[PDB]
């Protein structure tokens, strides 16, 4: 029995949680009650299996069972069988489910609901997160849940909870979104590009983090990590969590052979141990390391070694280059590796290979400078404009690049891209590139998966599917879509009401940014000069109307003077 297997390994508490997440992720629209129902029914069945490992259908695979249990509450998907049936669900996951925004009751109600029923208050948290983020890294969701519990458990018995809980909950919402985004990139890499693409990413990333580890060690770590994510991304949450535990054990047992910063991590609870290991900083770089040119460009055996085991050889190149460049972003290292490979492919087919591939490092110089100049520029701009204005600048840029993309996606993607400014610019040159460019890769992947749902721009498609590692350079190279036909104004789109006054300070900027997008789509060829001079107007329209006697009509009146002056510029 497979269910029995995993149950013992995970226990009843984790087993129940993971199954709840699996269900909320497949059928995101179904109510909490129903999932809870199916979870218990499934959990009890598991209990009978532990005992009689041949009872009902304890012989079956998790998918069969899980699928049949969901099919008692959903249709075409359920008509199919085994493989096809499961693939069906995976394809129907919704990255942008039409779910009501989630509002949180006053501190008092929460603590009551938490204290009264603790298991229920937590199961609902997992449910509400899993259904909105169909790809959240399961094992990590269990880690946030405990952290969530610790928040209430501590803050509800204090002097002023509002002050103690609200903050800690915000820190959790944000970090939970970042995590969700990082994991969405991992699944997309695996699902749209193949495991080879993910392995390459892992080697480079783990080699930067574990500089002292041996190639054969990193390779072992990479092979295992790949399996973990291959399972979590395919919906095999139980085995994923299981496998992820093993990997954490291994790493801790063999610390000395991997990194010296793993100590603090291995001295804590499972869930906290895994999370800690995944986020540990880079170990110090080994002292006396030879020059890369030695074994990779000067040696005359290059082509022979490349021919013998193209995969191991390139893998070794990446590890060697990555380990000594924690200052480079993972995508840049992958671009370098791609450049080196392309060179051996053509060069090793020449008369004198050596001569041909002798200057490959001169091919790197341009690739290393592009990212550095981009970062240097944009951080200088960020420092001058501040976050809000920087996001506006990016908003104008991206809309002009890909005007067809829906206004909600553009606004979300641009705001996020703009956060790269606060998140990375404060770091010194040395750590800026990994921070900025790898973060940009997560954000642009967001754009790509949201866009794939309803394609409207061949330019977004091409840049999203051509190369995983070149996405950022592809997007940056775009300027203005010259074939784009300007949109025609819509009264409703630019009519500001008094309801924007109740909305939070941020919910306002968001509205103004939404208006800026619509503007740009209407006047692509407009300049940043006019745009600014118009934005400041909208600001005025809010302050007036919002504080001017009983006026819900000012919105139509003040809005009239607005559009009038807006149609003029
Ligand atoms: C095996 C090395 C430690 C490690 O690293 C990662 C990826 C973190 C990242 O993406 O940078 C994980 C994980 O995904 O669970 C673990 C465990
Ligand atoms: C901090 C980096 C974020 C960033 O900055 C730019 C402006 C580049 C330029 O000045 O051309 C882009 C982009 O064009 O896509 C991105 C992404």
UniProtKB/Swiss-Prot annotation:
Outcome reported for the amino acid change (mutating residue 101 to G): In Yanomama-2
UniProt record similarity statement: Belongs to the ALB/AFP/VDB family.
SUPFAM superfamilies in UniProt: Serum albumin-like
Lineage per the UniProt record: Eukaryota, Metazoa, Chordata, Craniata, Vertebrata
Phosphothreonine: modified positions: 407, 409
Effect after changing residue 256 to G: In Nagasaki-1
Modified residues (N6-succinyllysine): 192, 423, 506, 551
Subunit structure: Interacts with FCGRT; this interaction regulates ALB homeostasis. Interacts with TASOR. In plasma, occurs in a covalently-linked complex with chromophore-bound alpha-1-microglobulin with molar ratio 1:2 and 1:1; this interaction does not prevent fatty acid binding to ALB.
Protein name per the record: Albumin
Gene Ontology molecular-function annotations: antioxidant activity; copper ion binding; DNA binding; enterobactin binding; exogenous protein binding; fatty acid binding; identical protein binding; protein-folding chaperone binding
PTM notes: Glycated in diabetic patients.
Residues linked to a glycan: 8, 47, 124, 149, 186, 212, 220, 263, 268, 300, 304-305, 310, 338, 365, 400, 426, 431, 481, 512, 521, 523, 532, 560
Result of changing residue 557 to K: In Osaka-2/Phnom Phen/albumin B/Verona
Residue stretches spanning the membrane: none
Binding site for Ca(2+) 2: 9, 242, 246
Predominant localisation class: secreted
Biological process annotations from GO: cellular response to calcium ion starvation; cellular response to starvation; negative regulation of mitochondrial depolarization
Location of the Albumin domain: 1-173, 174-366, 367-564
Tissue expression pattern: Plasma.
Involvement in disease: Hyperthyroxinemia, familial dysalbuminemic: A disorder characterized by abnormally elevated levels of total serum thyroxine (T4) in euthyroid patients. It is due to abnormal serum albumin that binds T4 with enhanced affinity.
Superkingdom assignment: Eukaryota
